[PDB]
Amino acid sequence: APDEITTAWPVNVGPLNPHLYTPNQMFAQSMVYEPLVKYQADGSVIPWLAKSWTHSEDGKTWTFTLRDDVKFSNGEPFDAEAAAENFRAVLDNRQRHAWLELANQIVDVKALSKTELQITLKSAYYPFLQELALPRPFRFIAPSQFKNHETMNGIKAPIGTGPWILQESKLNQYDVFVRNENYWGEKPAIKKITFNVIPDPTTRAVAFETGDIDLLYGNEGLLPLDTFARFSQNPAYHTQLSQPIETVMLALNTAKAPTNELAVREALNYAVNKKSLIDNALYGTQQVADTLFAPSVPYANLGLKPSQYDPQKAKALLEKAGWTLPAGKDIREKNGQPLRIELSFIGTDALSKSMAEIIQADMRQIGADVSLIGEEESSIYARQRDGRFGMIFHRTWGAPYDPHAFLSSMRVPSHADFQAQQGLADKPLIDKEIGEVLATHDETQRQALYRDILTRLHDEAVYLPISYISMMVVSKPELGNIPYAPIATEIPFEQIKP
């Protein structure tokens, strides 16, 4: 067993290097490794490995008082020296972390004593604590497990301070975690967690039906949504659907014809019946999105005007911009050129493909020829980085990344949002304002900057918001109610009480 559970993940958890990315899986890094301060659902952080902290008047120097009773799972002490060595290891690979502005902000980290840790910043970076709370990269592995005093070239054993320990990993088969019996905090009720490697959504559903696994926990891609709906009515099972956690949207390339034209982007934003899309492809399980961020997101309740489904208006917008229908043709032309737009997506993602077909059909009704480009994952990511797309599926990052970290990353050239925004005359101004808002402690100015950035992105129709999606759970009833973690990429295994 009653204290052992089995669940699934599409891939193995990776080597669990706390300071690196793919193929490390974030939820698993968060199981083993811990932050100085812990993110809470209300948007605050609480003391964690750091019991308290102070900051200088200019907000650039921070001193953390660490707990003195914490051991890594291998018995070695967690102290300020261990913490400082981790910050060094991360920042020795600084360029890799460019997406996360704290990595550019930290100018120094040193242990003042075994319990005192001092971090100095370039500027008064307001999201400092929230970014320390993230799953990665600023969490702590035992320094003994560095390879030649670094982590960027790999680690030895994945030794953290957290409530779970990686027991064993079998590539392409499973991963087993066990409870840390020497954890500094509350002991999890669950003793052992086995992750069966199951990449196919239907096969995950089958695995649950047959009883091979006890728990599924994920976003809208977790399992087939019609199957989820059926499960929700089945008294033999338990299901949950959370309140929305993030946005799914198209990014439109403002630097590529024909999406470089505002009138075209505006028309596209009237062309899709989102409610019907969700009811048709998402089995009615998600919410309609009108804006890049839902109004419930911090700093984002701005009264932005939705573009509702309105094919008549979309057509009128295109006509006015000189995109008219040739005799006998259904696809508009302007200066000889057809209104043709390429929508790229991961070809093996059935849900993406289904939504893409709906979007293609809806846009054809207003005279736009959307060409579907389904490709392998690596090719799509390459397209995102270098701007080789007309439209692309995209999503925001959920708490605590939205909106500040998502906005921050818009400045990074190797990101889809930067590329999508490249054609905007005001792109430099937007990037300047994103830089400013992150260092503002004038609360009035901070709200004003967020309003200006988000209003410009909205008015320029950079995105086509589709849905605010939720977390979903399928579980054996004996496990009980399954809690959600404040951080959308984490799974609160330590909170489950069968």
Ligand SMILES: CSc1ccccc1CN(CCN(CC(=O)O)Cc1cccc(O)c1O)CC(=O)O
């Ligand atoms: C392309 S993988 C990569 C390479 C170099 C530096 C960082 C990364 C990882 N990503 C950094 C941002 N990434 C946070 C993370 O992975 O820790 C954003 C993010 C936020 C919430 C959920 C995510 O799955 C997610 O990837 C790149 C990306 O997701 O665009």
Ligand SMILES: [Cl-]
């Ligand atoms: Cl990496």
Ligand SMILES: [Cl-]
């Ligand atoms: Cl991955």
Ligand SMILES: [Cl-]
């Ligand atoms: Cl706080």
Ligand SMILES: [Cl-]
């Ligand atoms: Cl000391």
Ligand SMILES: [Cl-]
């Ligand atoms: Cl070594």
Ligand SMILES: [Fe+3]
């Ligand atoms: Fe990422």
